[PDB]
Amino acid sequence: MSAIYKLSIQGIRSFDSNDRETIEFGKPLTLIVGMNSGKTTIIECLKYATTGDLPPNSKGGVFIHDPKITGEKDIRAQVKLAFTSANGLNMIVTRNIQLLMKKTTTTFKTLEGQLVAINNSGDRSTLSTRSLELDAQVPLYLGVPKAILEYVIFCHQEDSLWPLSEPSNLKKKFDEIFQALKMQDINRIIDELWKRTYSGTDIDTIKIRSNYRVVMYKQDVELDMRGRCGQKVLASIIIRLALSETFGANCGVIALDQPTTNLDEENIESLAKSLHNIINMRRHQKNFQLIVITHDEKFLGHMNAAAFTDHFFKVKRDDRQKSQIEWVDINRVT
Amino acid sequence: AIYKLSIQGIRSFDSNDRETIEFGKPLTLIVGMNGSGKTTIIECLKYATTGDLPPNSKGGVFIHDPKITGEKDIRAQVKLAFTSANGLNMIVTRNIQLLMKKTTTTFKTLEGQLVAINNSGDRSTLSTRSLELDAQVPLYLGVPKAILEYVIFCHQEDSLWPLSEPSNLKKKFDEIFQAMKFTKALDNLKSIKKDMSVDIKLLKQSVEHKEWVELQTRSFVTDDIDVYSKALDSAIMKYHGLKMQDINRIIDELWKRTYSGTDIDTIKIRSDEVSSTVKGKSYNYRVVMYKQDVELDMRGRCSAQKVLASIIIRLALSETFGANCGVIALDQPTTNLDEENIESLAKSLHNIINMRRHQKNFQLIVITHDEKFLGHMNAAAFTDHFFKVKRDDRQKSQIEWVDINRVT
Amino acid sequence: DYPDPDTIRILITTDNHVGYNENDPITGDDSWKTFHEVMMLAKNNNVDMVVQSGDLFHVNKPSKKSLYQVLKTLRLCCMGDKPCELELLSDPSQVFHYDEFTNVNYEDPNFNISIPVFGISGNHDDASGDSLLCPMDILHATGLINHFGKVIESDKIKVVPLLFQKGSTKLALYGLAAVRDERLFRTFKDGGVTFEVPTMREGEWFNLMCVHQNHTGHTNTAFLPEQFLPDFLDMVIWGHEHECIPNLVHNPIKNFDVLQPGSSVATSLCEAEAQPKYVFILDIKYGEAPKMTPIPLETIRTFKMKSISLQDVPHLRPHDKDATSKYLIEQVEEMIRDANEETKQKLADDGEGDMVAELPKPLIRLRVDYSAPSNTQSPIDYQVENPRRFSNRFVGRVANGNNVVQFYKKR
Amino acid sequence: MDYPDPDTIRILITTDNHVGYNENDPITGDDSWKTFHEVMMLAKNNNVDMVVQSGDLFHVNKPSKKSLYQVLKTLRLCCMGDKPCELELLSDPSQVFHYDEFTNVNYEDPNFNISIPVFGISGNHDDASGDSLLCPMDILHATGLINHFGKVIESDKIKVVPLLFQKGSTKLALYGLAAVRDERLFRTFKDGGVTFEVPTMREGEWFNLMCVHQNHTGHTNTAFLPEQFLPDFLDMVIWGHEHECIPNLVHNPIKNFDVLQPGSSVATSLCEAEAQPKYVFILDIKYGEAPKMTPIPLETIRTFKMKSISLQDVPHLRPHDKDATSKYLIEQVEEMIRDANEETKQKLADDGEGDMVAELPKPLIRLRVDYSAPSNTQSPIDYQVENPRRFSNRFVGRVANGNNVVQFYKKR
Ligand SMILES: Nc1ncnc2c1ncn2[C@@H]1O[C@H](COP(=O)(O)OP(=O)(O)OP(=O)(O)O)[C@@H](O)[C@H]1O
Ligand SMILES: Nc1ncnc2c1ncn2[C@@H]1O[C@H](COP(=O)(O)OP(=O)(O)OP(=O)(O)O)[C@@H](O)[C@H]1O
Ligand SMILES: [Mn+2]
Numbered sequence A: 001m002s003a004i005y006k007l008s009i010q011g012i013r014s015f016d017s018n019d020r021e022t023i024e025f026g027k028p029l030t031l032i033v034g035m036n037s038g039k040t041t042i043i044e045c046l047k048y049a050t051t052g053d054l055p056p057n058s059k060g061g062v063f064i065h066d067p068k069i070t071g072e073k074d075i076r077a078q079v080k081l082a083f084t085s086a087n088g089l090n091m092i093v094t095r096n097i098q099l100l101m102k103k104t105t106t107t108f109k110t111l112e113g114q115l116v117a118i119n120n121s122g123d124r125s126t127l128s129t130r131s132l133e134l135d136a137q138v139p140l141y142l143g144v145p146k147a148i149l150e151y152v153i154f155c156h157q158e159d160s161l162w163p164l165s166e167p168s169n170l171k172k173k174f175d176e177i178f179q180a181l182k183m184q185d186i187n188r189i190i191d192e193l194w195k196r197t198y199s200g201t202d203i204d205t206i207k208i209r210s211n212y213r214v215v216m217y218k219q220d221v222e223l224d225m226r227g228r229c230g231q232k233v234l235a236s237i238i239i240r241l242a243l244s245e246t247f248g249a250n251c252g253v254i255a256l257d258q259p260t261t262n263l264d265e266e267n268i269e270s271l272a273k274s275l276h277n278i279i280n281m282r283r284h285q286k287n288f289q290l291i292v293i294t295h296d297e298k299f300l301g302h303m304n305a306a307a308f309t310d311h312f313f314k315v316k317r318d319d320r321q322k323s324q325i326e327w328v329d330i331n332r333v334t
Numbered sequence B: 001a002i003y004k005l006s007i008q009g010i011r012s013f014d015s016n017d018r019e020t021i022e023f024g025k026p027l028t029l030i031v032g033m034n035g036s037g038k039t040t041i042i043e044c045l046k047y048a049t050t051g052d053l054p055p056n057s058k059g060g061v062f063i064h065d066p067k068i069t070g071e072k073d074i075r076a077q078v079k080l081a082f083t084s085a086n087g088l089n090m091i092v093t094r095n096i097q098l099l100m101k102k103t104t105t106t107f108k109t110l111e112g113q114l115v116a117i118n119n120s121g122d123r124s125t126l127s128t129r130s131l132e133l134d135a136q137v138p139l140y141l142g143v144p145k146a147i148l149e150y151v152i153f154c155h156q157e158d159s160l161w162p163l164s165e166p167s168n169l170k171k172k173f174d175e176i177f178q179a180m181k182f183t184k185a186l187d188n189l190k191s192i193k194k195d196m197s198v199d200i201k202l203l204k205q206s207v208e209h210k211e212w213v214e215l216q217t218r219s220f221v222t223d224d225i226d227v228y229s230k231a232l233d234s235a236i237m238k239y240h241g242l243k244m245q246d247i248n249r250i251i252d253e254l255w256k257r258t259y260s261g262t263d264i265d266t267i268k269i270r271s272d273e274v275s276s277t278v279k280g281k282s283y284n285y286r287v288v289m290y291k292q293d294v295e296l297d298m299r300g301r302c303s304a305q306k307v308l309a310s311i312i313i314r315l316a317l318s319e320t321f322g323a324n325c326g327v328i329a330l331d332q333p334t335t336n337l338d339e340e341n342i343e344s345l346a347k348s349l350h351n352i353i354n355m356r357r358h359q360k361n362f363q364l365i366v367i368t369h370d371e372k373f374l375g376h377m378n379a380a381a382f383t384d385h386f387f388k389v390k391r392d393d394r395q396k397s398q399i400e401w402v403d404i405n406r407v408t
Numbered sequence C: 001d002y003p004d005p006d007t008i009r010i011l012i013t014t015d016n017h018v019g020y021n022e023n024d025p026i027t028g029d030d031s032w033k034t035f036h037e038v039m040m041l042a043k044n045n046n047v048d049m050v051v052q053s054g055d056l057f058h059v060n061k062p063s064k065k066s067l068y069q070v071l072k073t074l075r076l077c078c079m080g081d082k083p084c085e086l087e088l089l090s091d092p093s094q095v096f097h098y099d100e101f102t103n104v105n106y107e108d109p110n111f112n113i114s115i116p117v118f119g120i121s122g123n124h125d126d127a128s129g130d131s132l133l134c135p136m137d138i139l140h141a142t143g144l145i146n147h148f149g150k151v152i153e154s155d156k157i158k159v160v161p162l163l164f165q166k167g168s169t170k171l172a173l174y175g176l177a178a179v180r181d182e183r184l185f186r187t188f189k190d191g192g193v194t195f196e197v198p199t200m201r202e203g204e205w206f207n208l209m210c211v212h213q214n215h216t217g218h219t220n221t222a223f224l225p226e227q228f229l230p231d232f233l234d235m236v237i238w239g240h241e242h243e244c245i246p247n248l249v250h251n252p253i254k255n256f257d258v259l260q261p262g263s264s265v266a267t268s269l270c271e272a273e274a275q276p277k278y279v280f281i282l283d284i285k286y287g288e289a290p291k292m293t294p295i296p297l298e299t300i301r302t303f304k305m306k307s308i309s310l311q312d313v314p315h316l317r318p319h320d321k322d323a324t325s326k327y328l329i330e331q332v333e334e335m336i337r338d339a340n341e342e343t344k345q346k347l348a349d350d351g352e353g354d355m356v357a358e359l360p361k362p363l364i365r366l367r368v369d370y371s372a373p374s375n376t377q378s379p380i381d382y383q384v385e386n387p388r389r390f391s392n393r394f395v396g397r398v399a400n401g402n403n404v405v406q407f408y409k410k411r
Numbered sequence D: 001m002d003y004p005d006p007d008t009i010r011i012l013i014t015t016d017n018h019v020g021y022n023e024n025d026p027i028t029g030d031d032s033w034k035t036f037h038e039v040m041m042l043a044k045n046n047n048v049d050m051v052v053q054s055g056d057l058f059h060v061n062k063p064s065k066k067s068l069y070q071v072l073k074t075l076r077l078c079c080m081g082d083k084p085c086e087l088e089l090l091s092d093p094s095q096v097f098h099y100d101e102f103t104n105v106n107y108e109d110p111n112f113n114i115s116i117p118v119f120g121i122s123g124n125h126d127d128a129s130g131d132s133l134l135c136p137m138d139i140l141h142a143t144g145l146i147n148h149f150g151k152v153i154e155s156d157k158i159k160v161v162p163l164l165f166q167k168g169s170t171k172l173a174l175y176g177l178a179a180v181r182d183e184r185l186f187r188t189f190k191d192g193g194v195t196f197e198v199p200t201m202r203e204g205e206w207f208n209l210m211c212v213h214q215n216h217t218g219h220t221n222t223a224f225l226p227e228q229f230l231p232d233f234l235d236m237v238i239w240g241h242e243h244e245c246i247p248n249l250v251h252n253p254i255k256n257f258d259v260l261q262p263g264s265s266v267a268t269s270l271c272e273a274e275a276q277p278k279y280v281f282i283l284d285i286k287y288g289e290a291p292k293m294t295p296i297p298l299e300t301i302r303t304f305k306m307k308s309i310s311l312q313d314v315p316h317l318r319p320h321d322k323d324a325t326s327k328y329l330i331e332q333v334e335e336m337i338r339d340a341n342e343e344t345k346q347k348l349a350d351d352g353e354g355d356m357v358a359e360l361p362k363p364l365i366r367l368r369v370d371y372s373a374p375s376n377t378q379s380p381i382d383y384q385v386e387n388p389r390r391f392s393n394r395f396v397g398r399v400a401n402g403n404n405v406v407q408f409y410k411k412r
C-alpha cells in the first residue's frame, strides 16, 4: 500500500473554523487516545474529501461547525489532504464545502477543488477541478475500492457492526467490491484469528456462505447466528480484518475505531495477539499503519505499545469547545 | 416485581434440563463471555411477561436448535415467578414447541398455565388462552404492554431508540398508547355526554304541550357532564404537562452528573404539540442539542453524546411513567465510553439505586464484563453474589452462583 | 523529644489513598506527597509505631508510582539503627497466619527496623484476586509493613491481636479488614465473632482496634452500630470516612473512645472535604489518661466550599444564558480570590516572603441547584453550563478545573 | 559445595525469571514463582558470593499482586544471613545508584544483613512505563532486596559505569546496560554515543563483566545488537532476552571474551526453542587462572514436550477427514503424554523417594499443526481440524495446560 501523510480538518466537527489543525501518522501503527473529542470523526475526514462521503443521516451539512455556536453568519470547512500516493506522487485536493446561510435558510453547495500532483522538488502540477472527477480520480490513484474505505478501512464508530444485519443489503453490497466464484479465500483468513483470539469453546469457524450471513459452525452443522448471536462485534472485526487483507491495497491498511467493544478479560488480553501477528507477518509488506482509536487500558497494555511507536496522537478539547491535538510520547500513557 | 425464571430451551440453553435464576433486590448482575447467553435471561424475562419473540428472532429459532441435539420434536418451558402488583404470586409458566419435519418445521406455541398462587398454594389456573396471556400479564404486573417491550426490558440489538430516530420512530413508541388509551375514555365520555346532550331535548319537548313532573329533573345533568369533558381534557393536558415534563426534569438532572460533570450544553425532548387537523390534540417528539441558547438537530450530529444518554432517556422515563414496579433491564451500559463517563455513570447509577430504596423495589440487571465498570458499580456494598453464565463440555450454558468474594 | 522510658508513641493515619488522581497534571502527586510528609513527620517525631486504618491505597491493584513512592518513603523513615523498644508478647504466627512470615519485621534478625508500620486492609484495596491478596500483604513481604487483621471467612470472624510490651505498658491491636457491611452485620447478629482477651493481669492492658466500615450509613442495614463493639475496648479508629474531626467521640455506656482521623487526599469534592485535615499522635501510658496531639497536614491544596440556591435569588429568569452565567461567575471568581489569598497567607507568613512566593492553585466547589421555580411548571428550566464551558474556561487559575461548580436539582 | 577458596569469587547467573506468567491457569499458575524460589534455594546452599541476572524478572511492566508477593517472599528470608559478603566495595557507588539517597550497594547499608547480593538490569518486559518513568526493579530496589544498575536516562547519551568489588587479590569489574529498544541502541552505536569508563588503576588484573539484554538474531534487517560491537577489554557477557538456555560458552576469536546465554526459567511460549532444559550457572572466578563454570540443573520446572507436526507428514489423511485427523492427533498426544509421564516418574524417582505413589505433576504439552494441502494438488479445501480449545478440552485432568494444548497454524 501507500501511506497517507496528512489531511486538513479545518473547521469541521469540533476543530475550530479559525485555525487549521491536522495530526500526523506513524508506522507501522498510528495510535489514538483520549476521551469520547475529535477522534471518532478524524476517521470521517479521509473519505469525506476523497469520494464525497457525507455521514448517513445527514443532509443539512451538520458536520461543519455550526455558526450559531460561534456566533456569525458565515462558517465553513476545508479539507486539502497533503498525502502520499502509489509511486510517491503526493497530491493535494481541497473540498470547498460551506455552511453559508440565506435569509433564514441553510443552503448547501460546493465549489471547485484542485488536482495538484506534488513534485519531489516542488514543481507541482494540477489536472482538473471537477468534484465528480475528483471522486473518480482520488480513488483511482488512492487505490482501495470505492466501497471499502468507507466500511472496511475507515468505518464509523457504530457502523462497525455492519455484517450482522440481514442478507439483502450485504448481498447487494458485495457486488461493488466485485465491481460487476471468486470468493474462496476471504473465509480462509476468517478463522485463524477466531481460533487464536476468540477464546470461545462453542464454535469452530464462521463462513460467509451464499444469503450472505454469519453462519456459525456447531459440530460441522451451521447454527446460524443471524438472530441467534460480543461474538457479533468480534466476528465483525475479523470480517474487516480479512477484507482489508485480500482485495485492495494502496491506502492506509486498517482503521479500527474502537474494536474492543463488549469483550472481557480472557478476550481483551487475547484480542491484539492477532493484530501483532498481522503486523509481524505483514511487516514484510512494504507498508502498514494500524490505526486504532481506543481508550482501553487493558487492551493497550497487552500489545506492548512501548514496543512499536514513540507517540500516540492524543486528542483533547480547549476552553472554547475546540478540540486541539497534542503530541505526547509513548511512555507517558498509564 | 420479578422473582425467578427457568429457561428450558430458549437460545443456547438445552431442552432436556431447566436452569433457574433467582432474582434478588435491588440488583442481580449477569456477567459471562461472548456466547454464553448472559442477555438471554433478560430476553426471556421479556418473553415470559409479554409473550413476544425478542427482536430479529424469525424463522422459528428461539428454542434450542434440534440439529445441535438431534431430537425431531424439540420443546421448551419458560417459567417466570413474579409477585403481581395486586399481591398475587403468579407463577406464569409458558410453553414453546417446535415440530420439525423432514425439511420444514412448524413453529407452534402451546398454552401455559397462568396461576395466582396465594398463601395456601391453591393452584388455580387464572387463564389458559395462548393469544391472551400476552395481553393479560401486563395487567397483573401494573404497567402497559409497550413499556415492557421497549423500556422495562430492552434488547441490545434494538436498544437504540432514545437518542435515535425521532418522528419516524421515537413517536411510534409514545403514540401507540396513552394517546390511544385516554382517547378511549374521551370517546366513551364524548358519547356519555351525547346521550345526555340529547336528553335535554326530551325535557324541552315536554313543556311544548308525567312529562311536567319529571320535566326539569336532569336539565342540569345535561351540563353536569358538559363541564366535565374538559375536566378530563385537563386531566390529559395537566397529565402530559407534568408526567412528560417530569421526564425532562430528570433527563436534565440525570445528565448533569454523568460526563465528568456533563456533556453537550443541555438536551431535552421537544414537546411541541403539533395539533394537526386529523386528531385535534396531538404530539410530535424530537431530541435536539441546545448548544448556547437555541436548539440544534441532534440526529446525524452526535457520538456514542449519544448512547451515554440513550440510557439516560430510558432510565428517566420509566421512573415516573411506569413507576409501580421498578424493573429495568439496563444491560451493557458501558460500550464506547471513555474514562469518566464510566466512573461518574456508575456514581450516577449508584445514585439511582441510592434513592430508589425508599420505593417498593428497584430491579436492575447489569449485563457486562468490563472489569472497569464491575469495580465501578461497587457490588461490595449491595449484593452478596453475582451470576455467571458459561458453556460446558457439550456447549450447554449453565448459570453459576459465583460469590462476590472472588471478584477483584 | 524522646518518649519517656515507659511511653509508647503511635501515629494514627487512615485513608491516605496513595494512587488517587494519578494522571491529572496540575494535581497528580498530592496523595503520595502527603503520605511522604506524614511519614517524614513520623521519622522526626520519635514515634515508636505507625498504625493504619486501611484504605491506604486508592485502587485494589495499585500503580507503580504509588508503590515506589510508598516503599521509598518507608525505607527512608522506618529503616534505621535505633533499637525499637517494643517487646513482643504474642506469637505472631497466629496473627500473620497467612504464610511463613510469622515474625514482625522489627523482630527480624536481618532487618534492624526502627519504626514498624502495621495496618488493616481497606475497602478500595481489599483482599482481591485468585489468592485473596492485598497490597498491604505485598508490603508485608518487603519487611516494612505488618499487614494484620486479615479475615478469611465472612461467617465466622476470629480477630487475633498482636501484643507488644514496653516498660510497664501493654498493647493490643485487633484488626478488622474490609468486609461488606451487611455481612459483618449478619455475623454480628448471631454472635459469629469472638474477641481473644489475654487472661493474665486484668486491667493492665490497652486494647486498640482499627475498623473500616461506615459509621452512620444512608442504607437501612448497611452501617456498623457503635454499640455492637464490646465493652472491653479502650479505643478504636474509624476509616472509610473522608471527614476529619480532631476531637474524640466518648461513649458513656460502652466506655470506649472513637476517633475519625479522616483522610490525607481529598477524594470526592463535597462538604466532607471542606474541613481541616489532620493526622494524629497518641502517647499511651498505663495508669494515666491517653493524650492526643493532632498535627495539621501542610501539603494539601486549599479547599473551601459553598452551597447556595440558584432559584432563590431574584432576577433569575430561567430562559437566559447571558443573565445567570455572570451571577455564577461572580461567586466562583470570588471564592477563587479568597482561596488564593488564604494560600498566600499560609505559604508565605512564615518568614519566607521577601519576594512574592509561588502559590499552589486551590480546589473550589460551588453547589447550586438549577431546579424548576417553586410556583410554576414551566417546560424549560435554567440553561446552565457544563465542565466544558464553566470549568474548562478556568484553565491556569483553579486546580479543580473540571468540577468547579455543582449542578443538581433537589428532588 | 563448600565455601570457595578465600581468593575465589563465586557468582550465579540467572535470567528471565518472568514471575507471574499465566497467573490464571489453575495448574500452571504457580510454575514461575516456584521455579524462582528453587533458583534462590539453589543459591543459598551453594555458597555463592553474588547473583547477577540479565533482566525480565516480571512478565509485564505492571506485574500482578501475586508476582510481587512471590518475589519479595523468595528474596527476603533466603538471602539475608549473618555471614558477611567478603566482596569489599572500594569505589564510590553514589553514581551507579543515583536515583535517590540510596547511593550504595545493599550489603553496605547499615540497615541490611544481606549475606548474598543480586545485581539485576531492567528488561523490555518490565521496562519503565506509566507517568513517572518507573520500572518494577526500581520498586524492588526501593525495598533494597535487589540492586539495580544499567538504567538509562537518555537513550542517545549512554554512560555505562562499572562497579568494583574486592576480596583477596581478585578485582571484579561489572558493566551493565539495561534493556532499551534495539533500534535506539544501534543508533547510539553508529555514532559512538556510548562511554565505557575503565578504571585507571592496576590494569591487567580486573575481571571485566557485561550483562546485555538484547536480541541475538533478528529476522528483520538491522534490529538487533551484533556481537562485534562490544569493546575489546571485556571478559564475559550475559545475553538476556533470548529464552533458549545453553550450558557452554561460545568463544570469540577477536573480542577477548566468550559469550553466555543463560536462557530463562519458565516456559512462556510453548515453542521448539523452549524444550531445552533450564539451568542456573555458577562461575568460580579467581586471579591466576581461567575461572571455571559448574552449571547446575533445576528440579522445579514442570515437564514439557513439543512436536510441531504438519498433517502432511503422516500418510493416510484425506482432506475431508475430521474424525480421522482428530483421532491421529489424539493418539500422538497419547504417546507424548506417556513419554512425558514416564520421564517425570523417573525424575521424581531419582530424588530420594521411589515408594510414595502420591501424584505425578501434569506435563505441559504443545502441538503445532500446519494444516495445509500440498501445493501440487489443486483441491481448494484444506486439512480440516477441530476447535483448538475443545480439541484439547478432552485432555483436562491429564495435562497441565487444559485449553491451549494445540495451536493450528499455517506455514507454506
Ligand atoms: N437460537 C439459538 N439456538 C442455538 N444457539 C443459539 C441460538 N441463539 C444464540 N445461540 C448461541 O448462544 C450464544 C448467544 O448468546 P447471547 O444472545 O446472550 O449473546 P452474547 O454473547 O451473550 O452477547 P453480548 O456479549 O453482546 O451480550 C452464541 O454462542 C450463539 O451461537
Ligand atoms: N454543531 C456542532 N458543532 C461542534 N461540535 C459539535 C456539534 N454537534 C455536536 N458536536 C460535538 O461533537 C461530539 C461528537 O463527536 P464524535 O462523534 O467524534 O465523538 P467521540 O468523542 O469520538 O465519541 P464516541 O466514541 O462516542 O463516538 C458531540 O458529543 C458534541 O460535543
Ligand atoms: Mn478512604
Ligand SMILES: [Mn+2]
Binding pocket: C015, C054, C055, C122, C123, C124, C212, C239, C240, C241
Ligand atoms: Mn474506606
Ligand SMILES: [Mn+2]
Binding pocket: D015, D016, D017, D018, D056, D241, D242, D243, D264
Ligand atoms: Mn525472558
Ligand SMILES: [Mn+2]
Binding pocket: D055, D056, D123, D124, D125, D179, D213, D240, D241, D242
Ligand atoms: Mn528480554
